[PDB]
Amino acid sequence: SSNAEVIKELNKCREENSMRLDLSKRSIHILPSSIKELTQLTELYLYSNKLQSLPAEVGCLVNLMTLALSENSLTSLPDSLDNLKKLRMLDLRHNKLREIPSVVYRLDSLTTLYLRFNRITTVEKDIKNLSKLSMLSIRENKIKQLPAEIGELCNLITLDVAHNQLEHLPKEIGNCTQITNLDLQHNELLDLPDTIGNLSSLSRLGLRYNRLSAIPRSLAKCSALEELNLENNNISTLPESLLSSLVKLNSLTLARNCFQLYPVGGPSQFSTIYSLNMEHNRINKIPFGIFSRAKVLSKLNMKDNQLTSLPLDFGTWTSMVELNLATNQLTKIPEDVSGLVSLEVLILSNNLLKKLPHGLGNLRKLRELDLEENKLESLPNEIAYLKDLQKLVLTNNQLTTLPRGIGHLTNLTHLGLGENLLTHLPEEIGTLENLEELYLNDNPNLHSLPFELALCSKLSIMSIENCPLSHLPPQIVAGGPSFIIQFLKMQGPYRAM
Numbered sequence: 001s002s003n004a005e006v007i008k009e010l011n012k013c014r015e016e017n018s019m020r021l022d023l024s025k026r027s028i029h030i031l032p033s034s035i036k037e038l039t040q041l042t043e044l045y046l047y048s049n050k051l052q053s054l055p056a057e058v059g060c061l062v063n064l065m066t067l068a069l070s071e072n073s074l075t076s077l078p079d080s081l082d083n084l085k086k087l088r089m090l091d092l093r094h095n096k097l098r099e100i101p102s103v104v105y106r107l108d109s110l111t112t113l114y115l116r117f118n119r120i121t122t123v124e125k126d127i128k129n130l131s132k133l134s135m136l137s138i139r140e141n142k143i144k145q146l147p148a149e150i151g152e153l154c155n156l157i158t159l160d161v162a163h164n165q166l167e168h169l170p171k172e173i174g175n176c177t178q179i180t181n182l183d184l185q186h187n188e189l190l191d192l193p194d195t196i197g198n199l200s201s202l203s204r205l206g207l208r209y210n211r212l213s214a215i216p217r218s219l220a221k222c223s224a225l226e227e228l229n230l231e232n233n234n235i236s237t238l239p240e241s242l243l244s245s246l247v248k249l250n251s252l253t254l255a256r257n258c259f260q261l262y263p264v265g266g267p268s269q270f271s272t273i274y275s276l277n278m279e280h281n282r283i284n285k286i287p288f289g290i291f292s293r294a295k296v297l298s299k300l301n302m303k304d305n306q307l308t309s310l311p312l313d314f315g316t317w318t319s320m321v322e323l324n325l326a327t328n329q330l331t332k333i334p335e336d337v338s339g340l341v342s343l344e345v346l347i348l349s350n351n352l353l354k355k356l357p358h359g360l361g362n363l364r365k366l367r368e369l370d371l372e373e374n375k376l377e378s379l380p381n382e383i384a385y386l387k388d389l390q391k392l393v394l395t396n397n398q399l400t401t402l403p404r405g406i407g408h409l410t411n412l413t414h415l416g417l418g419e420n421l422l423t424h425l426p427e428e429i430g431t432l433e434n435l436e437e438l439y440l441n442d443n444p445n446l447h448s449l450p451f452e453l454a455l456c457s458k459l460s461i462m463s464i465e466n467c468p469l470s471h472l473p474p475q476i477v478a479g480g481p482s483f484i485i486q487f488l489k490m491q492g493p494y495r496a497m
């Protein structure tokens with residue numbers, strides 16, 4: 001879009017006395033200084049261009065309330081922007097700012113400042129000039145520190161400093177008591193100030209990927225917390241009762257820390273959680289009763305801990321929907337697994353299991369069952385009742401066949417049986433109305449597919465690589481699933497259908 005098109009547009013604007021001018025998405029290199037005429041502008045959009053500088057004449061637009069500048073190549077702003085004494089909203093994200101332009105520290109009208117994705121290293125003390133700020137975003141820059149004068153921003157509601165190099169917060173941040181979203185993910189925080197309990201309106205606190213080894217006891221005063229994410233730190237305990245005081249917590253991530261037990265406290269801690277993620281710790285026990293009150297707990301992740309067993313009451317988790325216990329040392333699943341009537345996903349991959357409880361058959365809503373990497377020598381006959389099951393992964397167990405009841409799994413689409421000890425499959429494989437994918441690779445002893453495999457008319461993926469299949473003619477099985485399945489339709493007794 002050419003210099004003369006830009007000037008045509010500015011004349012249309014100044015003539016219609018329009019109060020908004022959108023010059024965005026036009027690969028402009030230089031904004032003409034004729035824009036000084038358009039003093040009746042209250043919004044000017046320049047985002048997504050090739051600007052490497054803002055003309056000074058933009059400072060004449062003394063009624064601007066929005067200056068949208070993202071996705072350009074600005075490395076500074078001109079000092080004349082001082083005249084924008086009503087500018088409430090300034091967007092500079094995705095530029096090449098080596099710092100915040102000093103003029104910006106003088107726009108004390110601003111209530112919204114976006115600086116995501118730049119190369120800023122310092123936030124100057126002058127930041128206290130912008131006390132009307134209610135939203136401040138500097139995520140994806142290179143800020144090593146925040147000044148104490150940030151406690152002067154007594155109207156922040158959203159403070160986003162994710163993906164920087166902060167190692168501390170200044171205790172004065174606790175003067176910002178209107179804050180409700182604080183994102184500190186991907187920094188190098190070693191600790192949090194104790195003033196943090198001042199933030200009694202804080203509802204989303206993101207500390208994932210930091211160097212924290214303790215949570216301040218005062219965080220139990222952030223009674224409005226709804227989501228707390230501490231994923232990947234060096235935390236090994238929390239101050240007692242902490243979770244009990246967070247009377248609205250919906251989701252909690254403690255994953256990838258140093259915990260060996262659950263946080264201490266009663267069911268009061270999880271009375272209100274809906275999602276609880278603790279993968280990648282060393283927790284050796286789910287305490288009896290911690291979920292006795294979690295009436296809306298529906299996603300629990302305990303993957304890769306030190307579980308050797310499940311609690312007596314674990315079938316009381318009647319509203320749970322996703323349960324991941326992969327990569328523990330479980331040697332059996334209790335029979336009260338039948339109480340989990342809401343379960344739709346069960347991940348037990350890479351434990352120590354040889355058989356499954358009879359009670360597994362009662363999860364009438366289970367859609368995905370992951371059992372890879374176990375020691376399974378057979379499946380129970382009661383899986384015939386997993387009426388909703390659609391994905392069943394059994395790779396690298398030691399099954400020799402499958403229950404005849406397998407054929408009742410109407411809804412089953414993915415049947416992963418690779419790396420087993422299968423000798424044959426039951427004829428009732430044929431009533432698998434919806435089987436699309438059937439993995440059978442690496443079964444050194446599978447010597448025949450049944451002819452009723454041809455009645456799976458949605459079957460479009462079958463791997464049999466490295467299976468003798470010596471009961472079928474060698475040259476058929478030499479031509480792969482193409483020819484094996486053809487052979488099973490036409491030379492079996494269903495070629496009529």
Ligand SMILES: O=C(O)[C@H](Nc1ccc2oc(=O)[nH]c2c1)c1ccccc1OCc1cc(-c2ccccc2)ccc1Cl
Pocket residue numbers: 158159160181182183184185204205206207208209227228229230231
């Ligand atoms: O995906 C992201 O990096 C972020 N969404 C998020 C998801 C999980 C996180 O655990 C962390 O430790 N930080 C996280 C960020 C995103 C995505 C799209 C648009 C804005 C985003 O971020 C804004 C934001 C989020 C929070 C927050 C804090 C705790 C839990 C959930 C959200 C607070 C302030 C702001 Cl401004």
Ligand SMILES: [K+]
Pocket residue numbers: 232233234256257
């Ligand atoms: K860690």
